[PDB]
């Protein structure tokens, strides 16, 4: 069901981006065979802005090099590329979210209180009323303590996963 994975890897990407990826890829494919040595996988990934740990690179080669060819074809390469891209993106957002919280928690007590919540909303310039701010608090405040912890904040920001 790799061919399934392969088809889903291509659908995630736009054709121009896929061709750009190939253009980089083809730089390490001499014989014009459509595959590179798994030795160059990390390199190509990195030039195209992915940052796989050595351990994840080792897992991938392991997955693709089941026959001992010592090579990975462009299709299994887009598959690995999308896995990496998703793994990386998610990661970025976790971090920005963390930053966000630290910024919103103006007294750094570990919670966003109704006063802090109001000030940040009101600063958007949006025409939100008190009733509106207190509605978002109740809805997000899961243990009914009147404040939002990091835990409720993630739930708040990311909705229903």
Binding site for Ca ion (CB under 5 A): 105, 107, 109, 111, 141, 143, 145
Within 18-127, strands assigned E span 35-37, 71-73, 112-113
71 known member of a binding site: yes
Q: Comparing C-alpha atoms, which of 155, 158, 152 is closest to residue 110?
A: 152
Instruction: Report CA dihedral (55, 56, 62, 63) to the nearest 10 degrees.
Output: 160
**Smallest gap from residue 158 Cβ to Ca ion (A):** 16
Q: What is the largest CA-CA distance in the chain?
A: 68
130 known member of a binding site: no
Q: Are 72 and 64 in contact (CB under 8 A)?
A: yes
Cα 61 to its chain centre, rounded Å, is 22
**Smallest gap from residue 141 Cβ to Ca ion (A):** 4
> Which residue number, 77 or 101, has a Cβ lying nearer to Ca ion?
101
**Smallest gap from residue 103 Cβ to Ca ion (A):** 11
141 known member of a binding site: yes
> Which residue number, 124 or 143, has a Cβ lying nearer to Ca ion?
143
> Which residue number, 85 or 156, has a Cβ lying nearer to Ca ion?
156
Rounded CA separation 69/64 (Å): 10
**Smallest gap from residue 151 Cβ to Ca ion (A):** 8
Which residue matches tokens 């990091």?
150
40 known member of a binding site: yes
Q: Comparing C-alpha atoms, which of 71, 7, 13, 65 is closest to residue 44?
A: 71
144 known member of a binding site: no
Annotated binding site for Ca(2+): 29, 31, 35, 40, 65, 67, 69, 71, 76, 105, 107, 109, 116, 141, 143, 145, 147, 152
Annotated binding site: 29, 31, 35, 40, 65, 67, 69, 71, 76, 105, 107, 109, 116, 141, 143, 145, 147, 152
């Amino acid at each position: 069901s790799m061919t399934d994975q392969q088809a889903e890897a291509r659908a995630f990407l736009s054709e121009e981006m896929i061709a750009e990826f190939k253009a980089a890829f083809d730089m390490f494919d001499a014989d014009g065979g459509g595959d590179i040595s798994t030795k160059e996988l990390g390199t190509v990934m990195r030039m195209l802005g992915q940052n796989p740990t050595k351990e994840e690179l080792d897992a991938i080669i392991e997955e693709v090099d089941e026959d001992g060819s010592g090579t990975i074809d462009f299709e299994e390469f887009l598959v690995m590329m999308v896995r990496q891209m998703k793994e990386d993106a998610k990661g970025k957002s976790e971090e920005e979210l963390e930053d966000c919280f630290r910024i919103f928690d103006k007294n750094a007590d570990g919670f966003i209180d109704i006063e802090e919540l109001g000030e940040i909303l009101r600063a958007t310039g949006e025409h939100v009323t008190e009733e509106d701010i207190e509605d978002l608090m109740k809805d997000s405040d899961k243990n009914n303590d009147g404040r939002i912890d990091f835990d409720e904040f993630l739930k708040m920001m990311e909705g229903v996963q």
